[PDB]
Design a protein around this ligand. Sequence first.
Ligand SMILES: [Cl-]
Ligand SMILES: [Cl-]
Ligand SMILES: [Cl-]
Ligand SMILES: [Mg+2]
Ligand SMILES: [Mg+2]
Ligand SMILES: [Mg+2]
Ligand SMILES: [Mg+2]
Ligand SMILES: [Mg+2]
Ligand SMILES: [Mg+2]
Ligand SMILES: [Mg+2]
Ligand SMILES: [Mg+2]
Ligand SMILES: [Mg+2]
Ligand SMILES: [Mg+2]
Ligand SMILES: [Mg+2]
Ligand SMILES: [Mg+2]
Ligand code: NA
Ligand code: NA
Ligand code: NA
Ligand code: NA
Ligand code: NA
Ligand code: NA
Ligand code: NA
Ligand code: NA
Ligand code: NA
Ligand code: NA
Ligand code: NA
Ligand code: NA
Ligand code: NA
Ligand code: NA
Ligand code: NA
Ligand code: NA
Ligand code: NA
Ligand code: NA
Ligand code: NA
Ligand SMILES: [Sr+2]
Ligand SMILES: [Sr+2]
Ligand SMILES: [Sr+2]
Ligand SMILES: [Sr+2]
Ligand SMILES: [Sr+2]
Ligand SMILES: [Sr+2]
Ligand SMILES: [Sr+2]
Ligand SMILES: [Sr+2]
Ligand SMILES: [Sr+2]
Ligand SMILES: [Sr+2]
Ligand SMILES: [Sr+2]
Ligand SMILES: [Sr+2]
Ligand SMILES: [Sr+2]
Ligand SMILES: [Sr+2]
Ligand SMILES: [Sr+2]
Ligand SMILES: [Sr+2]
Ligand SMILES: [Sr+2]
Ligand SMILES: [Sr+2]
Lengths: 145, 119, 115, 246
Amino acid sequence: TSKKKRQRGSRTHGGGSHKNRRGAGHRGGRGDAGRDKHEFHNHEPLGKSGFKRPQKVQEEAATIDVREIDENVTLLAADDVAEFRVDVRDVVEEADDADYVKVLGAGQVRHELTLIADDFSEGAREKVEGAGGSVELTDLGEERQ
Amino acid sequence: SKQPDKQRKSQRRAPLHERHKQVRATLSADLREEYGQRNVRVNAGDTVEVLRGDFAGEEGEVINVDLDKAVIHVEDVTLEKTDGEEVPRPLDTSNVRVTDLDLEDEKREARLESEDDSA
Amino acid sequence: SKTNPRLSSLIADLKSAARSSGGAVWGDVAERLEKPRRTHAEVNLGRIERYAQEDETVVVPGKVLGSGVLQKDVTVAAVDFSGTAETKIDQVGEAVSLEQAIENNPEGSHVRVIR
Amino acid sequence: MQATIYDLDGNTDGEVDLPDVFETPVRSDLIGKAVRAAQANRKQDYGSDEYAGLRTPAESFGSGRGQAHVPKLDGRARRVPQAVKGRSAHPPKTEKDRSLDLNDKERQLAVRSALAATADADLVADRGHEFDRDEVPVVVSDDFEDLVKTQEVVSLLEALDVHADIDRADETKIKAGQGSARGRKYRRPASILFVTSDEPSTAARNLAGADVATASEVNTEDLAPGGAPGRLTVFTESALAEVAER
RNA sequence: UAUGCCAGCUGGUGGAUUGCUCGGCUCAGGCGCUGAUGAAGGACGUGCCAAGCUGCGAUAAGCCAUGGGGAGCCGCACGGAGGCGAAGAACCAUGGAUUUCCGAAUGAGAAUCUCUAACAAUUGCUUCGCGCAAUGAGGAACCCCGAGAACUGAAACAUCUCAGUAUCGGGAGGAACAGAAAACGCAAUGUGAUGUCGUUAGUAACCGCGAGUGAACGCGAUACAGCCCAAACCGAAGCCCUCACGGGCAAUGUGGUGUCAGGGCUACCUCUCAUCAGCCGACCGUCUCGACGAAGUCUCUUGGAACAGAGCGUGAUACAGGGUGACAACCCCGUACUCGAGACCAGUACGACGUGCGGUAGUGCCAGAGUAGCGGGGGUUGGAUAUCCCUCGCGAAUAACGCAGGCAUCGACUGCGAAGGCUAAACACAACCUGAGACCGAUAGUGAACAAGUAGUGUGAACGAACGCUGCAAAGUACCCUCAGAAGGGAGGCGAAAUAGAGCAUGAAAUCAGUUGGCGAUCGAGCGACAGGGCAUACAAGGUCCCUCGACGAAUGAC
RNA sequence: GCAUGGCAAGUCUAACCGGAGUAUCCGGGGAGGCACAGGGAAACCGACAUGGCCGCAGGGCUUGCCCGAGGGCCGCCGUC
Ligand SMILES: [Cl-]
Ligand SMILES: [Cl-]
Ligand SMILES: [Cl-]
Ligand SMILES: [Mg+2]
Ligand SMILES: [Mg+2]
Ligand SMILES: [Mg+2]
Ligand SMILES: [Mg+2]
Ligand SMILES: [Mg+2]
Ligand SMILES: [Mg+2]
Ligand SMILES: [Mg+2]
Ligand SMILES: [Mg+2]
Ligand SMILES: [Mg+2]
Ligand SMILES: [Mg+2]
Ligand SMILES: [Mg+2]
Ligand SMILES: [Mg+2]
Ligand code: NA
Ligand code: NA
Ligand code: NA
Ligand code: NA
Ligand code: NA
Ligand code: NA
Ligand code: NA
Ligand code: NA
Ligand code: NA
Ligand code: NA
Ligand code: NA
Ligand code: NA
Ligand code: NA
Ligand code: NA
Ligand code: NA
Ligand code: NA
Ligand code: NA
Ligand code: NA
Ligand code: NA
Ligand SMILES: [Sr+2]
Ligand SMILES: [Sr+2]
Ligand SMILES: [Sr+2]
Ligand SMILES: [Sr+2]
Ligand SMILES: [Sr+2]
Ligand SMILES: [Sr+2]
Ligand SMILES: [Sr+2]
Ligand SMILES: [Sr+2]
Ligand SMILES: [Sr+2]
Ligand SMILES: [Sr+2]
Ligand SMILES: [Sr+2]
Ligand SMILES: [Sr+2]
Ligand SMILES: [Sr+2]
Ligand SMILES: [Sr+2]
Ligand SMILES: [Sr+2]
Ligand SMILES: [Sr+2]
Ligand SMILES: [Sr+2]
Ligand SMILES: [Sr+2]
């Protein structure tokens, strides 16, 4: 049995005094009324902040952490196995509607990898090389200077 | 349709030419064999046997066929009024069985004997 | 008011085992499965790899998922496994249902709970 | 497991591997959910006229004439819910979404689960079906599809000691209630489900309580009418195999 | 024991309840314009008897033809009388005839009539004559173009909101509108007319930066379709009316060419299946209508009635639904299967006729002005500097030019040619047809299951109810008595039932008459709860209870 | 938010398309949404698959002593 189903005979259906549930006065005004007066509490404060750049002058990078790549090396058998060689671009989802692919260095790298991507983070490299690996910056990646 | 309201409605409001089928009755075994049909539209000339009501068992000539009320009058199947007069007790053709046809009309006979169609 | 009939039987079997055999884990896991689904365990392989040890059955009072890498040759007993989870585990060890685990070890000995 | 195959005379004629799906653990709750959804999804939207009871300029006199402040017209109370001939306060509404969603996986799992309940004679018996057989479901040669006369299917069912179920369904119930006023006067027990492969069996369909389906689209409802798992089914050689990949 | 209290019994009153459904409500599919050739609507007529509804129109519930249909018929409406039908009526489909007056209402006028040949009025053509034509008004909503609130929200209120909503003016169609880039701007080596649907997204943008308002490109779909002028160069090679004769139009340009795959011209190559125009003309599918259509009306019992129970039997590509004196696949209509016709798709698709695609070189020959653009003032928008529009003023270039790419200018780059036009399909609505339903079931559901927009209210605009059920069959009560009596009553007749006898299935409560039990003319008021006495009680559905004594014997506890 | 159920580093399809027993239902459709990294107005940069100590449940042992998921207290890491 639900709560609704138990209200018949109660008269006030949980509203307390029958003078309570009336119009918007019982809510202190409609919508966000009083968000700066009687109900300022827990409301985001008033004001403007910052600016926005035009949406077509904005770049959206497709990122991936070494952890993701490294944890699936063997599974990614459909990708080079040299002295593994992996073109991150063929690995990252959503890597199409993105302006470029970037490898981030979150996690560990328990294998020697040769990674090819449009860009890497300092830590991404330190780790890849640290495990006897290399990092190859794509041609597009040739926009660092 | 499948809806009861419409079914009854189409029956009660059927135009006259469509009411002939509301006065049809099953044919005796012989007649069925003779004309290759299971039933026919009862005519004011036919002979019929009552198979259901309080008059079940009686046979007689059809004296009248009312399409408006979809009922028939059969000789001797009557009720006695208060003044003593005798009047017919209407019958639903569904409770009757044709045992002898009145084929005085070439068209009806032709219809009955034809195969592609029934009477 | 669980709705899955199999979950109900499992819980009933888990109690029968804990009451009839020297096993407190089964009755423990039972108490947890009786709790709301949101509190049930959702464990990825990476966690099993970090705290499991061979010849000690890993018991998950929930479901095992496939993220991470498992190398240890361990037997994992769970309410359920994702298709991938059961695959990876079976490669380096073995995936088993609590229903099996309860039958092979009613006393519920040498076992580690993971969530 | 293996399922015995029968010829149109009812005699055994080899046997085949009962596909794995028939080993899916039976999940009556998932099945119930699936049926509940199919049933809700064919329900039609309805609701009272949105202006019903509102076609009146009726006004209240207010205080003064020793009368309750109720809208009146020509001395008759109107519009308001407590007034006879007034509007309905919270009536059925056309805008209401009467459909139920169901993830494809959850639904497919239920179909498989219902398929599997079909191979459990004890269940099939519990569901209510009347039969004198031990193996279930009943598998028959693909020639079954070539049958034309209903009575021929009768003989085969009698030979298969499965006709008793049709006798069970050969009794309609005239329902209590006003459903009758809307065309729902009768209802009847569900009997055998015939699952063929090319086309539904025209020969079996008119049998009392019978249902016909095709392996490619047989659903949770035919497999478990009303959500009750374990319907006495009869598959076709090919139907049986094609149903394996659902 | 009066007046009387409480409960029940018999009979009323009343119309709840149960059951029933010819009406509603909602959804889905199909379909979709009418009118001066006088519509839609209204008035008045029209029947043997005729008030209402329906139909029809002085040929008046109808006339004629063809096909269907069939032995009956003369609407709703179950009367009386009379008539029609084998000379094939009724009825149905298609087509035709008739079709009063008012009504856009059109010769003039007028509350449906009147007065003395009429497209009134405005237009086009014009034989300049109403000679030939157009317009007008209607339609449930849908659609397009204009006019445009307030209550309300912001807890007041003015910007903002409600909302371009309600309502008003004008107008088209079966659908409208839009539409082949002076586009987009995931900026690109990219997309490629337009609606619409899903999403992009409550994102960008707006905003007492409050409350609130709120896109687009793109993407996935639906459906797909692209063309015609102006001018250049030609210059009467042309068009309209008429059978013809003949007339009118047209150098202020008819017609050819041409239309950003720019074109024209001069000089060449090659070639057409592009386009445009016209001819022919479906399949299939969908919707509706129709034909055909299996198998019990067997036994016994109960009943007024078998469609019930028991027994025997049958069909099924048909066990949807309905009817029939009660629960019916097999009694009747239907239903499955198969078949036929009309409508829509669509004058579309295909096919065929004609036309002729395209490429090179040269040529500053052509290419839409109060425009592009700027400023003043307004409105509007998400449009912010960067929306769309109105208004006042100013105002350009000529392809070697010009516009756009979200502030302005200049260069570069990319895109694209405004100031002329047409265009199928995919989408909206629901009048109309058909189907459907976990919708309502007569105080419900429509206001309306009935006389329903009826009766009735208001000067008018406008407002507006209530009323469902005899029975299987009318067998709808003959005769007699009574009475002023076609009233009513009594007796009687019918039927299973008249406590089914006319708002006639059932028949609650309030409440009324009569009556039974209990109380009652010396006695006190939340009307009772719980205990205990009196009196009252047919059966059934409850069967216990009382006294002696004895057993057991908690707290407590004596003489 | 919560309870139940599916699937899980993923999850769900929307419009719509095909089929069919034709509003149900079977198959298809991942456009797009949310989740899988954050911080910063922006430019832009970009993280613990575990390093320490407590310790509940549970497990182990030779019955106080080990292992101790979750949890608790810290380190440390990304960014302004
Ligand atoms: Cl930004
Ligand atoms: Cl985890
Ligand atoms: Cl694009
Ligand atoms: Mg015949
Ligand atoms: Mg109402
Ligand atoms: Mg009831
Ligand atoms: Mg006139
Ligand atoms: Mg206010
Ligand atoms: Mg539109
Ligand atoms: Mg304020
Ligand atoms: Mg707005
Ligand atoms: Mg845009
Ligand atoms: Mg405004
Ligand atoms: Mg009413
Ligand atoms: Mg009565
Ligand atoms: Na209240
Ligand atoms: Na009204
Ligand atoms: Na709805
Ligand atoms: Na139409
Ligand atoms: Na009349
Ligand atoms: Na006429
Ligand atoms: Na005219
Ligand atoms: Na003239
Ligand atoms: Na206010
Ligand atoms: Na005020
Ligand atoms: Na504002
Ligand atoms: Na894209
Ligand atoms: Na009958
Ligand atoms: Na605007
Ligand atoms: Na201006
Ligand atoms: Na542009
Ligand atoms: Na009523
Ligand atoms: Na008493
Ligand atoms: Na996706
Ligand atoms: Sr409350
Ligand atoms: Sr109010
Ligand atoms: Sr509030
Ligand atoms: Sr303040
Ligand atoms: Sr995507
Ligand atoms: Sr009639
Ligand atoms: Sr009649
Ligand atoms: Sr006052
Ligand atoms: Sr196109
Ligand atoms: Sr131009
Ligand atoms: Sr700029
Ligand atoms: Sr009433
Ligand atoms: Sr209505
Ligand atoms: Sr007045
Ligand atoms: Sr009498
Ligand atoms: Sr004692
Ligand atoms: Sr999916
Ligand atoms: Sr921790």
